[PDB]
Each structure stands twice: as structure tokens, then as C-alpha cells.
Amino acid sequence: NNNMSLQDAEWYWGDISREEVNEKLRDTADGTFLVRDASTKMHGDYTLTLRKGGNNKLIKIFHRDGKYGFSDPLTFSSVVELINHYRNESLAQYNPKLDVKLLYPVSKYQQDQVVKNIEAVGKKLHEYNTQFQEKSREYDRLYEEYTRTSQEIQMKRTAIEAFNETIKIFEEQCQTQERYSKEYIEKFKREGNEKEIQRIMHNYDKLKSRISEIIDSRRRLEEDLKKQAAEYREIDKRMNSIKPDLIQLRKTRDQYLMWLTQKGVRQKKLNEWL
Amino acid sequence: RILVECLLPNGMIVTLECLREATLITIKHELFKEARKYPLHQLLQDESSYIFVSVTQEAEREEFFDETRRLCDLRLFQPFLKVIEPVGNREEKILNREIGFAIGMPVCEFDMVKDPEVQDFRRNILNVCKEAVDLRDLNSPHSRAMYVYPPNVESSPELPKHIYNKLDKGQIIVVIWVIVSPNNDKQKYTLKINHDCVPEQVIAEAIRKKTGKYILKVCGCDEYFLEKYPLSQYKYIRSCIMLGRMPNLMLMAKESLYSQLPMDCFTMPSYSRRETSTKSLWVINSALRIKILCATYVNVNIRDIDKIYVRTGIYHGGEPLCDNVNTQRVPCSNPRWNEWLNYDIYIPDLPRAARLCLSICSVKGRKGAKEEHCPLAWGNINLFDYTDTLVSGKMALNLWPVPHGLEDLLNPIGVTGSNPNKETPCLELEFDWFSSVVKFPDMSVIEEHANWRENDKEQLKAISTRDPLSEITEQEKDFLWSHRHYCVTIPEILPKLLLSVKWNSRDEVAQMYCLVKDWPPIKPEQAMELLDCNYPDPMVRGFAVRCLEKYLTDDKLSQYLIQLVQVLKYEQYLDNLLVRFLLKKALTNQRIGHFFFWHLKSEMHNKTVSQRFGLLLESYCRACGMYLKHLNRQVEAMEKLINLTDILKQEKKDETQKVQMKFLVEQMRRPDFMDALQGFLSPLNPAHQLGNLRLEECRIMSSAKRPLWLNWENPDIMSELLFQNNEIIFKNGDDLRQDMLTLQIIRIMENIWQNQGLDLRMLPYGCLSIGDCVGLIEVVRNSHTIMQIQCKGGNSHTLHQWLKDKNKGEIYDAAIDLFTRSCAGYCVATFILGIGDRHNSNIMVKDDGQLFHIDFGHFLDHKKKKFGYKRERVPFVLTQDFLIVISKGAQECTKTREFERFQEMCYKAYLAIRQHANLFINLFSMMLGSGMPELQSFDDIAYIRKTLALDKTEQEALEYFMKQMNDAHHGGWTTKMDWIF
Fold it and tell me: Which residues are recorded with the post-translational modification Phosphotyrosine (chain A)?
């Protein structure tokens, strides 16, 4: 290469704060780095950030006596000199704990060259905005539906538990009455009164009819529960299907907005008029 | 008409027409009355031997010992009554029923769990419960009134100097009402007394001028003077001094207060009564190893995705201890991996608070060169349990759904544990089996594991002054770690020193433990930031809890109660020092305990922390005492109000408001509503008692979702002096956590400005969220929206002429200056915080001239972040209507002192807040995990960092402020009123 300037350097960045550094340096490979101006706004200070060990670091560059360097003594007259020096040499001798090279620099040139008439791009961005807003409205409505459906799943879950408890208490009552009624039917059949025997068949028939009714209720409620669970699973699948294209359109819209901003045309005061 | 199908124990049934108002006494009487006609009646025993049982509407077979309770409020399932023999005592069963009703879910679910941590916490928290209970009875009967009516005083007995001049040479005129003997009549005495007076000599002077023996009381509500504090320290007295009001107090008898105050008793539940050398963890020599067996099932399509994988990594708080380790992308048809996973971390280097954060992510190749990822579900696993043992062996983990608005692959700040539901994606885990139980080493191994001055200290203080989220570099970290032994002289640097160390080591972590164990105690506000998600170490949180125990007072504890409740979720284990301190403080202060209960009660709709908070309500309700009756009454009132709302909000969208009013009044003719809505303390303030419920001024307005306006007559004996009617808006369908946070921040800013020496007073009214999008709003009497003010006025002078004719004479200038000060305070607050734009309706003006804001939404500029653009917005633009009042309608402001006074007071407010910004940074850092869309990570606190211009020094912060509030005002805000240098 050559001694190409700092302004057009790939790793250098302009008015950049922490949140966008974290946005670009998110889940990237080890050694990924960039250089931006310090938030202290001291003239010609600059800070180096790199993702080593799974977390973003913040190297400070000193500008004492018009010279650059990581610490006393300063041995580089330009930032590019030590940037290339530490790109071509590991940091093992400098710091025993830190052992990494400046492998992959973060460069905006890729996004500058993959983007590709002002009215045409303006209406394209407007259509992108409309699609984004309708997709987000669909996302919000169906997320509300998903949460609500989970609420009804919980409600019929409690209903199923209550029905199950009623079934167990009724079967326990039936077992207890069968166990404590077999030792008194002998006298009843010896005396032979048709009225009270008819009454016991009538009462047992009514009780068994009620048991059948509540069993039918439990079965239909559990059928409703499983079909609503299937609908809930389908809604979740739709969520997982429509999340990634939504976030991709979000990134595309942000890229277009940042390109328009760096172009210098103020679209915020004209697009809103419509 | 209610048909109840009784179930007799002898095998017969009956279809009986049961009246709505009949209780179980009549049911049992008429049941046994007709039993004789039925056969086999001889087998029946006496009524005592049989007790009715049934299954409740909330799906639990709950005992029914409440024989005198009415039929309407039984929350019963399908109508049937079961008769069994008694199987236990009655007092604890009634207590458990009341506790479960207060919490929301029955204690049977809490009892029927298999997790040993839940049972151990339930068994062990009762120790501090009974300790607090016996502590509150140590000075009986004085301590009983101490608990029930604790003093509402301020932290320091010293009076601010700027308000001492407001007094008549440091003395207060005090009016003392007293009942003569036959009651009634209006007999008034007024006494002049200084500020540092104590109530015993106050009553001594009152008695000695009349012609532990009497007690004071604030007229209108229940506030009492008990403890040896200066009379000016009480909040009521200070409020009256600020308002220039005569403090109305009445004299009562201590014996009557002791008689009307009920007794308190604590009963131990039935579950209360229910070697080996081992090798340390630091001797194992092997990397951490995880096996992902399979995922049972995931919710993702076949023709919309191609391949999925699990994205997992070790964390310590939010700081990864190692890089994320992935698996081979398997097809989504068969989520089977069977892949051993290795990490670049050794077992002895694992910190105590280490976690295993994992997620299921889907990769889409697309035609683009770069591939994108989208998480499916997430789940966090503690590598250690509450018994300090490394997790091992077979384990299955249920996975939570991804939060809305979160796009990062993992969720390292989240609840550790499995989703309670079983219809969720379950990931199969497996840990290395070390043929034994691996335990974290005890304090001795750490303690003796270790041990194996220049004037350039200004850098340490300089980095101490910066905010916790300031830019910190590894040069700063190395400087901090190198001079850690000299950091004792500056205890401020403890959070920065903690953030300097990296937690994937052992020797330096031991050294940090040795340092923290000998750290001097620090300010409660400086130790409160040590409780957020960034400090998960048990020793650090123990030190912070110790500092809160030593130095935090009850006033400040009630000030920061909501954040202290919030940081209970960040605690990894159920039993810890923070919850013990919170429960000890809530069991010795009824006012604190009330808000504790209501905060935790609101925060249980979230199933992530449902169990860990349900256990807290369980323990507190066991140990709170007689307050259960008032809490149950409040809960009944709130749930009936919720029913009243949601039977109309969704079912009556398409009808006119007249039919809605008819529906509302016809249920307000149902005696149950009046019966429940009487004589219960307001949840907003327990000192208020709500009496009768009138209907002439209880209605709904034309808002978006018809909030309920409710009025209660004050039943106090001499309520005429104070407010006569209590008005509360019951809002349903709007989240109020952000509103509570906004009002809290307003209260701290007002306190800061008052303490500093500025009369920049606001109106921080009362808000309380009681559950899902439901809450109570305290409304202000004699207040109007600017919208209706200008509507009745009419154009630009309507507010000015309103303030003219509402209070004319020598009081006009007082109204003008109060308006100016309130307007300046709210300008500064709304600029700094970033509340949504103000309208005519959002701004509320009082009769005497004070103004305030009522409608709050998102605070950290969340609503206007749809379009990506870094800029600062000023919501409270000063319209010409306000400038007319500020300048008193002057044509030109260049020869009036009012404009420059307004400027300088705004600048002083901004400088005060910029000096105290650490408190707000810590508060928004502690309130992160609440689940608000507007506050999800530190990028939101970056907004409050850049509106106060933390990075900029105090010089250009001024110029930045004036640039904001003049390009928002289209100019007109220029230069400096006085050049200092």
C-alpha cells in the first residue's frame, strides 16, 4: 500500500459514539477493530476500539508533544504508523494479558460500494418506509394476538385442572360410598322396600349422569385447549418467520437514511409534508 | 336465581333454590331440616362433625372453614358441596385462605413443588419474619403504634438555611384543636413555638396555657407524632411551611389510640417444623465442557428457514468470560446435535456468579454476502446452586420466548431457570461428571489464597467524579488495578475498581474479595448502584446491603423503594441478604410494608418472577399481622373495579356513552359495590380513609379508554380543615410504570432544587400501578387543563386574564412568580428527561398560579426513535401564552428583570441536575429489567447521558443548553445576564 490519508482510511470513522460501535462490533470475530474520535472532544486525541475476548475494548491514543503513541514514551508521528505496526505485529510484548492482532478492520467502503435519480431513490425509500410500517403494524397486532392467546391457554389450563380435581373428588366419593354401602344393603334387601331401592337407583343414575356431563365438559375443554395450542404454535412460527425479514428491512432503511444524511440533502423537512 | 346442587355424605343429593344473599348458616339449617324426610337420616352426625368443602373457581380444592361468609363471594366452581371430616386446625387454614386470596394464587401451589430451593427459602425466611415480629413488640404498647403509625420525618434534623428566613425568627404559629368533653363544638387555641421543639413540651405548653399523656394528630387523615424528633422535621409541617399554610393539628388521647389499635400475633405454620471432606473446585484441571443433546421441538417453518443452531456462552453479569461457542448447523427438521462444547475458560477460574446463557438462533443465507441471525428462544442456567455446588449431570431446561424489541442473539440479563410451561422449546443439557460433588471453596481458601505513594492522585479523584457509564479504557483499568491499595482514601472509586477487574481469573478475584471485605462504608446512594445487573457477585451485593442497613434511613428507603424492589429480580438465588433486609424493613413499618406489598403484587403478571415474588407475598402476609384485613379490602375493591372496567372497555366499544352511563349506574345500584367500596385505606396513601361513595361526581370522561372517576367522602371527625373529598382516577389499559418512574425522578429533582436553595417547586402527585395496565392516579383539586382554560376564555391573553381575575390585588405578583418558578422547573425537567410532547391538555394549571404536567408517556425519547437521527428535542416549548405571563404582558423584555431571572434560574436548575446526575444514572440503571419498551439496555441511558452533556465540561454545557432551548424556541435566548470573569 502507501501512506494513504486518515480521512479516507478504512478503519477510521467520523462522529461516532458508543451505540453504533456496539452495533457494528456485535458478534464479530476476534481482532475486529476501528478507530474513532474520543467523546471528550479533545482536539486530535482519537480512541481505538477492538473486540477481543468476546467484549469490546477501548484503547486510548495519546497526542503529547505533537506525537502519537499508546503510552509514554511516544514513538509514532502518525496514527497510521502504529496502526500498521500493530496490524503486522502482535501485542504480546506490550501486555502479557492481551494477545491479539488487528486482523479485520471495520470499513464503511463495503456498504458504500454495495449501495447503488434523486426522485427515484426518494420514492423507493418512501415505499420502503410504507412497507416497514405496515409490516410493523402486522407484527404488533399479531404479537398482541399471541399474548392474548397465551392468556386463554392459561385460562383453560386452570379450567382443566379444576375439572380434573372435580373428577377425582367425585370418583373418591363414589369409591367411599361403595365401600361404606355394601355392609348395609343386606338388611335393605331382607326387609325389601321397593321405594328406597328405587330412590337409590334414581340417585345413582342422577349422579352418574352428572359425572358423564362433567366428563364431556372436560373432554371438550381439553379439545379446545389443544386446538388453541396448535393455533398458538402457528402464531409463534409466523413470528419467527417474519422477524428476520423485518430486521433486514430495518437495516436497509437505516443504511439508506444514513446515505441520504451523508449526501447532505435534508429530507426530514420535505418528506413529512407529503 | 342460583341453583346449588348439594352432595350429602350418605349418598343422596338435592336440587335446592338458594337465595343470593343467604349465607351457609341457612343453607345448612334448611339442608338438615329436610334430611329427616330423606331415608338413612340416622347415619348423619351432628353439624360440628361435618364441614363443607368444594373446589374454587381458581382451580384448587380449598377448605371452607369460613362458615359465616356469604354465598356471593365464594369464588366457586361448578355448584356442589362436599362433606368430609375435619383434618386439621382452623386458624392456620383461615390464615392460608386469606393469604392466598391477597396474593392471587393459593398457597397450595407454593406447597406442592419439588424444588429444594423454594422449600429451603420458605423454611428459612420465617426466622427473620419472627425476629421482626418480636422486635416490633419489644416496647409494647408504644412499639405497636410505632409500627402502625410510623413518623413521616426527614433524614436530617438540621433545617435548610434558605427557608429559615421564611419563619418569624425561626418560629411557627401552630393551631391546636381539641375536644372539650361532650364532643362537638369548635374550640380553637393557637400557639407560637420554635422549630426545634419536641412534641412532649408542645403538649406541656398547651396544657399549661389551657388553664406520655396526650398525642398529636394531623387533621383530616391519620398522621401521629410519636418519636423524639423536632417538629419541623415532619413532612406535614414542612409542607405547610412551604405552602405558607397554617398547620392544623388536633389533640387526642393516647389511651384511645392504644384501644382502637388491634393486637398482633404470629403463628408458626405446620411446615415450619418440617461426615465428608470433599475436594475444592480450584483443584480441578480441565476446561468447562457442555453437551447439547437435542431440542424437543422448535416453532419454525420448513420453507422459510434452512438451518438452525444453538448460540451459547458463559457470562458474569453482562460481561462474557469467554467467546461464544456454537454448534454445527443442523437442519430444523431434526434438532439433534450431540456435540460436546469446549470453552476457553478453566474450572477454577469460574466466578461464583457465573452463568450459562444460551439461545436458539436461525441462520438465513439469503442472496446477500453477509448472513443474518434471528433468535428463537433463550434460557439462562446458573453454573452454581444456592448450596455453592457446581451443577453437574443430566438437566433439561425450558426456554423463554424472546422479548419484544430485543434483537441481540443472547439475553444475558434475564431470569435464570426453566419456563414453568411445558409446551415450550426444551433444550437438553449435560455437564461433566467429576465422580463426586464439586463445591465452591469456602472463605478460608479465598482469604489465605492471596498474599502468594505519590501526589499524582488527582487522576483517581477525576475518574471518581465521572458517571458510572463514562468512557473507561484499559489504561484506566490498569491504573486502577495497580493503585488499588491506595484507593481506600477514596471510597467513591469502588464501582470503577470493580469494573476494572476481569472476572475470568482467580487470584485477582481473591484479591478483590480481600479488598471489598475491608472497604469502608460508603453513601447509600453510592452503594445503591452496586445492586444493578452489572455487579452479580454475592460479596459485592452483600457489602452494598450492609451499607444500606447501616446508613439508609426510612425516608430514603421509601424514596428508593421501587428500584429496591426491582433489583430483587437480578438476584440469582431466592434467599439472599437483600430480600432479608427488605423484609425486615417492611415488617417494622406499615407504610413501607404497604408499598412493598403493592409493588410486588403489581409485579406478578410477569411469569419470569411470579414464584420468587409470590413467596415474598406469602412470607410477608404470614408476618405482617392485622394489616391483612385492610389489604384484603383493598384487593377486593381493586378487583371489582377491574371487573367493572373490562366488562365495558371491550364489550361496549360500538355504543354511545349514554348506554354506558346507564350500565355503570345500574351496577352502581347493586349493593355489593357499595358494600365493598367503603372504609378501606387508599392504596395511594394508607393515611387516607375512604368513606362513603357518592355518585353525583363519579363518571367517565371522553378520553381514549374511559378512565373511571371516583370520589370518597372523608370520614374524619374534623375533616373540614383539610380536603373534604378524595378523588382518584382508575385508569385501565395504560402502563403506569413509566409514569411512576417519571414522577419519582421529578420528586428527586424537586428535593435537590429545594435543598440547593432554589424555590423550583413542582407537583409530584401520587401514582401506583396495581397490575396489568391498571393503576391508581391521584388527581389535584382546583386544577384545569390549559385547553379548557383557553376554551372558556375565548385569544392569547386568555390565560393571563384568567390569572388576573382569579386572584387580583397584592397576591397577583405571588401568582406570577409561582407560575414562573413552576414553569422553569418543568422546562428543565422535561428537557433533561425527554418526556413526550406537551399539549394544551397535558399541562395542568392550579388556581393560585402553579402549573404542572399530568400526561406522561415514554421518557427516553422512545416514541420519536422510529427514524434514525441523533438530535435533542425540547417537548415543553414555551408558547407566547406563557411568555405573556412571565413578562407580565410586556411589549419588550429587554428592560424587565423577569426574563433574566427566568434565564438564570433555569441555568441554575440545569447546573444542579448536571451536578447530581449520578443519582439519575443509577436509577435508570437499576430500573433496566422492568420490561418497559422505552428502557431495555444502556443505549437508553446514553440519551440521559447526552442531554445533560456529561462528556462536555461545565462551560460548553451551558452553550449546548441554550442552543437547544433557543433553536427549539426559534431564537430569542442569547448571551449571559452577568459576566462573572
Answer: 143, 256
Taking Cα atoms as reference points, which of B586, B607, B493, B589 lies closest to residue B226? Answer: B589
Q: Report B:369-388 residues touching A (Cβ under 8 A).
A: 372-374, 376
Cα–Cα dist B559/B546, whole Å: 18
Quote the DSSP letter at residue B153. B
Say if residues B951 and A40 touch (Cβ distance below 8 Å). Answer: yes
d(CA B58, CA B401): 26
E strands along B754-842, which residues? Answer: 767-769, 774-778, 783-785
* Residue where the block lists cell 452503594: B527
Nearest CA in chain A to B59: A162
Q: How far is B886 from chain A (nearest CA, A)?
A: 32
Strand B188-194 versus strand B171-178 pairing type:
antiparallel
Q: Which of B868, B823, B963, B944 is nearest to B468 (CA)?
A: B944
**Distance in angstroms (rounded) separating the CA atoms of residues A244 and A226:** 28
Classify B430 as helix, strand or coil.
strand
Contact state of A47 with B867 under an 8 Å Cβ cutoff: no
Q: What span, in angstroms and rounded, lies between the C-alpha atoms of B681 and B638? A: 12
Q: Note the helical H segments in B136-174.
A: 142-148, 161-164
Q: Give me the residue from A58, A177, A236 closest to B11, CB to CB.
A: A177
Q: Which three cell numbers stand for residue B77?
A: 366452581
Task: Please name every residue paired with B363 in a beta bridge, in sequence order, or none if there are none.
Answer: B307, B373
Distance CA B309, CA B377 (A): 11
Selecting from B59, B409, B473 the residue whose C-beta is nearest the C-beta of A58 gives B473
Cβ–Cβ contact B456 with A under 8 A: no
Q: How was this structure determined?
A: cryo-EM
Closest CA–CA distance from residue B374 to any residue of chain A (Å) = 6
In angstroms, what separates the C-alpha of A206 from chain B's closest C-alpha?
9
Q: Kindly list the distances between the CA atom of residue B242 and the CA atoms of B42, B156, B236, B489, in Å, as whole numbers in the listed order.
A: 77, 17, 10, 40
> What span, in angstroms and rounded, lies between the C-alpha atoms of B656 and B789?
27
State whether residue B953 sits within 8 Å of chain A by CB: no
Residue-wise over A181-192: b if at least 16 C-beta within 10 A, else e? eeeeeeeeeeee
Q: For chain A, which domains are there?
A: 18-113 (3.30.505.10), 117-271 (1.10.287.1490)
Cα B612 to Cα B601: distance, rounded to the nearest angstrom: 12
CB B286 within 8 Å of CB B432: yes
Q: What is the resolution of this structure in A?
A: 3.1
Residue (of A143, A162, A156) closest to B423 by Cα position: A156
DSSP state of B355: E
DSSP B707-767: PEEEEEE---TTTTSS-SEEEEEEEESS--HHHHHHHHHHHHHHHHHHHHT---------E
Q: Where are the beta strands (DSSP E) in B90-133?
A: none
Tell me which chain A residues have a C-beta less than 8 angstroms from the C-beta of B409.
Answer: 27
Contact at CB, A169 and B82, closer than 8 angstroms: yes
